[PDB]
Amino acid sequence: STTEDLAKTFLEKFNSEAEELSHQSSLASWSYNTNITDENVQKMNEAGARWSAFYEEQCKLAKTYPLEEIQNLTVKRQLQALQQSGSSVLSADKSKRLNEILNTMSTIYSTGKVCNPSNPQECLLLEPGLDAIMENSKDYNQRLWAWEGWRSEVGKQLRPLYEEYVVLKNEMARANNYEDYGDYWRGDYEAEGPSGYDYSRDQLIEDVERTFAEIKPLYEHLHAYVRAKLMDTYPSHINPTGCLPAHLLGDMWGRFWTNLYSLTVPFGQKPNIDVTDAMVDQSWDAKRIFEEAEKFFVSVGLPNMTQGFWENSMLTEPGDGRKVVCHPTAWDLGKGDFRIKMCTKVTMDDFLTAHHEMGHIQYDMAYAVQPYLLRNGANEGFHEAVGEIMSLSAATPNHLKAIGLLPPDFYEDSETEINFLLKQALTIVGTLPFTYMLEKWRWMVFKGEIPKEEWMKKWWEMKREIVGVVEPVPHDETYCDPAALFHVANDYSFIRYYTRTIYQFQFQEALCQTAKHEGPLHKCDISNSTEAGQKLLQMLSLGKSEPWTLALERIVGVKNMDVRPLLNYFEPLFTWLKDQNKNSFVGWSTNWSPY
Amino acid sequence: QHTDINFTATASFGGSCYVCKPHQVNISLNGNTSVCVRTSHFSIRYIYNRVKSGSPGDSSWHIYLKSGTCPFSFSKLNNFQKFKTICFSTVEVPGSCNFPLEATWHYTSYTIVGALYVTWSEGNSITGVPY
């Protein structure tokens, strides 16, 4: 019978045995991630070893089915996907080393402690203590204790592991016939697709860089403005022409500057855009947050969350003493089981985060109508963009009002407009140069443009040029400070958090025109617009069945990233900053440092 | 005497597209395909029963029946209505009232999986007690 028919046999087999083994692997990852205990680690491993076995075997039993010879462009898609992948081309011994390195890096990160030099029995973890310092503190020397303690006492530990890790993931890369791990990753963004729709994986860099250069001015001015204010708080530590000391930025990294809002708000006498204080004054619990998020999603005509979601999500840190993983994730366990894991606290941040994470669950619910192999977001940016679109509508002061978290007599004026677009720049515009640098470093280390004897040299050479951020303390190559960030130690591509950001405005533009919103798009709240709901759901439910380029054309005009809606969102703010900066020195010098 | 009729839909949900339709849905008038009321009083209730699947995706799976082609509401039958003949079947029989049986995953897609078939000659010999 026709080889294409004979390959449908294969696909049908896969799409049955998979949906049991997937769910059972997912169910055991849940338990570990919800109850870290050595016997739940074991069960997790076993079931995932069942999955790995099957998947890597059926990858090879699918390469036997040649792609030119198949004409159905579903069975081509599905097969292509099975075929390609697999950290499977490695020695049983070298596969097993990777996974020890990987699991060690993960748990070194999970369990790292930085210890008061006054009380050696007092010893602090990122979650929950050190991140709380770095988010809340204003004390220059407490920030540096934490910032440095983390890098010196866990980043160092990470360094030898990280070196082996690049060696072996580079091997896994080249033995699946890519150039280096950096290339392996960039191929989430490869489309073969139809005519006029393809995209290669060496154009991601080009286009990331192209679009980043166009951001650089809005970011420079934001930067000027915030170093200007931070001086008011750390005078004698901040040079009005140098980069910004790294420990002072809001995170343990300065991934987002959001937590710098306190100090940089332009018009603070006005009602607080940051609605954390209102939430606490109104006794908002995590249930309240997730309910309100649900209700948003319903108002645009997208489904409410399934009973199973409310039965089995973990929406706070449990009180039974269990040790759990708090890093907020939106699980598709398959078989219609959808959950969230999230140690939620009463913060405009976890409120926006709940909207984001529930957006993930909606793309997840939508594409469950697609064959197992195609039920993934189009690229890794799409998934996180759909999430951030919800935050875009849910953070606008208008929606804040109608929720209750702004007093009933509230009315926008040009001062609160600027307030909003500053916070939403700290969070959005701020993370753009961080995300580009971290991954340029990674991609270049992977290419081997950067040898081991420059790993921390180039890092802080690039962090000072691209990002405008300076180590407070010298770091030799005994450190691996990149691996002091979750995503790096847990082996996750990071460029998704850049592509998400250019898309989330492209998409928002589209939906707002379909929501027949006039006026500035930063005043768009697609809330109550069932028509925009439909338009979004129509992409959501395609999953990976089409190229990501084609999937842009459906909702947005173009078939590639376009930084223009992002520039227009922030144009008000661009003009206020540019005024607010004339008698200031915009840009930095990579030469000054606090030491 | 008095006859009870349990009209039961039992469904299993796995398969290829868990969300699109139920896998199998057996339909039964008292463990048979056909019951005629032969007593003075009768009750009929609809029972929905899922099988265990090891997935909380169950319970977002709703199978229920609809107002069909006939002047009765299923619930109205049990509320002291009166007939001469009344018979219930699983499969379409001649000249019948049809109560269609729709299934749905958490109100996404709706997908009809059978129906309850009612045949009746008006009279004052058979009663529908609700107890």
Ligand SMILES: *[C@@H]1O[C@H](CO)[C@@H](O[C@@H]2O[C@H](CO)[C@@H](O)[C@H](O)[C@H]2NC(C)=O)[C@H](O)[C@H]1NC(C)=O
């Ligand atoms: C490609 O093949 C799939 C099957 O692998 C086709 O999907 C079928 O489409 C018909 C349309 O009448 C349905 O009745 C079947 O239920 C579908 N699946 C099965 C099980 O065969 C699909 O239409 C084909 N065409 C393309 C290019 O997508």
Ligand SMILES: *[C@@H]1O[C@H](CO[C@@H]2O[C@@H](C)[C@@H](O)[C@@H](O)[C@@H]2O)[C@@H](O)[C@H](O)[C@H]1NC(C)=O
């Ligand atoms: C989810 O909502 C259910 C009611 O569904 C509502 O009406 C249907 C037709 C759809 O429009 C749906 O999106 C609406 O929400 C409730 O029965 C169910 O309990 C709700 N589930 C939970 C637990 O949130």
Ligand SMILES: *[C@@H]1O[C@H](CO)[C@@H](O)[C@H](O)[C@H]1NC(C)=O
């Ligand atoms: C946590 O895991 C242990 C086994 O490691 C198990 O006995 C315990 O019941 C689990 N707790 C919960 C509430 O899941």
